Amino acid sequence: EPFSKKEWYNVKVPKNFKRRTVGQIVVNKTAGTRIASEQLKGRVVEVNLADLMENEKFGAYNYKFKCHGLKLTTDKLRSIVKKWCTLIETSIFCIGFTSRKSNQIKKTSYAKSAQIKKIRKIMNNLITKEAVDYLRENKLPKEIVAKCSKVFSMDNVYIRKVK
Amino acid sequence: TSKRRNNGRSKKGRGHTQNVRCSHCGRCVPKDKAIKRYQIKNIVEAAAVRDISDNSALTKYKLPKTYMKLEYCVSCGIHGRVVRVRSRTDRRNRL
Amino acid sequence: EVIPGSTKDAFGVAHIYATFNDTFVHVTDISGKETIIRITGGMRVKADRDESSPYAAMTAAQDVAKRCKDLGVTSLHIKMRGEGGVYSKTPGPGAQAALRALARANMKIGRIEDVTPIPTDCTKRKGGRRGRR
Amino acid sequence: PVIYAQVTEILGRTGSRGGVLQVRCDIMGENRQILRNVKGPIRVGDILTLLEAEREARRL
RNA sequence: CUCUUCAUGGUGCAGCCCGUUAGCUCGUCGGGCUUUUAACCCGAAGGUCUUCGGUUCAAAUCCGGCCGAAGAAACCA
RNA sequence: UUGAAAAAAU
RNA sequence: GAUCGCUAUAAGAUGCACGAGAGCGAAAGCAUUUUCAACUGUGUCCAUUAAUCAAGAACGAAAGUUAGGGGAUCGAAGACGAUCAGAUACCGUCGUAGUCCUAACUAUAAACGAUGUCAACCAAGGAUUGGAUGAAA
RNA sequence: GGAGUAUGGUCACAAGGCUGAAACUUAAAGGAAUUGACGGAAGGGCACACCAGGAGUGGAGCCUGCGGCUUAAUUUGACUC
């Protein structure tokens, strides 16, 4: 019997996050070693905001929790990449793209090098100052599309990773 | 003699462009001369998408798609039937 | 009745690694450090060229289902991937064969993700300038 | 344990020469569509016998 | 001197430590494929499995001296 | 998967 | 105790997707983010100061040389395993110089737009990069 | 063609770079397009071409034609479809 009992335990997330128990994790049993080697085994990764906030409007993220950080799912990152626009990314990592317009006819919407830096200075001066980490989404890549819309049109603004 | 007015590439105002690796051969091909193909595919095929839906642990899970861009060389793009030899008049088409 | 080490209904993570030369059906727990059962394509065939065939991949995905049932695992997260480091990012023919076989064995399929590792900026690739002729 | 299926339509002939026909069948037990490679003469009306119905014969 | 191993067509390698009548290639002859040559494929012949005894329903094949080579170790006429 | 060669002038 | 799975560490190299018959540069060439040239604008200034150039000079991909550091991946030579009549090759595994940086050499490319530099005239059309000028908030 | 070769000069640590012939040999070498043929190039159809099969031939005796051998002569034409 390879398993031979072992032991199954429970994972608790902090008390601000609805669901407070995600699942089970297996370990060995007490020997000259120790079972509280469930420390630094904090790499339990859940699609987070669709299985632990119990709502599939958040279902394109991933979280990890020490016994850590968050990351955008791989499918979402590929999907929001557009062929004929400009990719703007800074560092918390946030990524955006130049948008089209209703009356716009020309295919390509490219931002200038100078215009790019303006968007990459606002985006770094409001990710700090709004530096808990504000939790959820609460729509604040929203004064990133309303503060840079004076410079360029932007649609796909996300926060892809926090370390 | 000259078969293509653009010489098979898409570079006009530059002298050098970075190399990339062919998808099938792993062969160094220039970025502008390469054959670019963007493919979108669901991770679960249409024949088996049903079987996942019979036993799904989620409420409104939508199966995502795979996003990869592949670049081929002329030698393997023709062999893989990505592109074909065209008529002398049909070569000028760009649609 | 119940084998030691089993539990009630639980969620696992299935790592289906499918190249054109093998197919790995490997399941762990949500932590990922502890693995339950790992059966490859070559574990079920006696020919080296059959280690990638869908039948071998589908067979190796059936003992994993029955062992997961024995251990009390009733659902699996899927993370399909292929040898896409610098090589082809397309998983082999055994990627889909195992997933359908896992579902057809009366198992709940949770989330599915393609975790094929694409390189941000890679190293050199085998073959040289002229590739594989 | 053999489960039969009803041939619905013929997709074409494959297998180097013409000796194998690709037909999409449904199982009368649960009206489940299945694609199989058929050896021999076949037409839409008749049914087929499938001792194994776990494989999909889409042939890549 | 003690222990152990091997010997098979012209040649080199197979073979079952139980056994019931011995093969794969090169070498020879002939035929097939090819428009023809070279490659390629096939058939036949080629040893009776070192030499003599037992072992039984039968031995290359299990056991004994004998041959004729090999490895380790020992040596007061 | 393997596919080498075909003497000179008429 | 391989392949496989989850973390943590150190250097080396690289700079995906955006990325295009788009931009810059005399050419070679230039893609992670935080001194020079050019166009446009001008009721500014000089006044022919200009063009092309034997000799001469600077820059000049890759490879190569010398001496240090670095040495992850790949890999002229080479060692195996295949295939073959043979294979000293294409195919697979491993692997020295090299591939990276610094200093000094080298000065050649299908270094190509195979199209020398400057100037005048020259049919029709859509679109694009960067300014100026009207309308359109 | 000889040949960017010999020699002379010059640059480099070197590999080599720059300048650079002649003797001799020969009626062509070459450029763009046309038609045909061919492709172990692509696309579309066809044939007992193959597939699913039947009968077989190749193995044996004999009849018969060809080659070879023989002989005074064993007359000769035809040698992939």
Side-chain angles (χ1 to χ4, degrees), chain C residues 77-131:
Chain C
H77 285 346
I78 315 289
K79 301 194 164 300
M80 291 215 268
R81 83 169 270 251
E83 191 206 343
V86 284
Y87 297 92
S88 48
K89 270 143 204 91
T90 302
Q96 306 275 5
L99 182 53
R100 152 185 279 244
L102 266 165
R104 263 177 75 74
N106 282 10
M107 189 89 62
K108 310 301 186 341
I109 323 285
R111 313 234 149 224
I112 314 165
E113 178 93 83
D114 210 85
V115 288
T116 285
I118 76 158
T120 285
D121 319 294
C122 65
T123 40
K124 208 67 102 174
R125 192 216 190 261
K126 159 178 82 92
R129 287 194 97 248
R130 265 107 65 76

Side-chain angles (χ1 to χ4, degrees), chain C residues 32-110:
Chain C
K33 223 156 195 152
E34 301 85 30
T35 89
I36 291 98
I37 176 75
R38 164 194 55 228
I39 312 291
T40 93
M43 312 215 88
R44 277 317 160 268
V45 282
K46 306 294 137 259
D48 320 78
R49 87 217 66 92
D50 303 340
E51 309 180 0
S52 309
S53 94
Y55 172 77
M58 105 167 279
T59 305
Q62 285 157 345
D63 4 305
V64 167
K66 110 171 67 77
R67 174 72 135 136
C68 277
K69 259 178 257 292
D70 290 9
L71 250 293
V73 152
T74 63
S75 315
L76 288 177
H77 285 346
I78 315 289
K79 301 194 164 300
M80 291 215 268
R81 83 169 270 251
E83 191 206 343
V86 284
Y87 297 92
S88 48
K89 270 143 204 91
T90 302
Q96 306 275 5
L99 182 53
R100 152 185 279 244
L102 266 165
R104 263 177 75 74
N106 282 10
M107 189 89 62
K108 310 301 186 341
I109 323 285

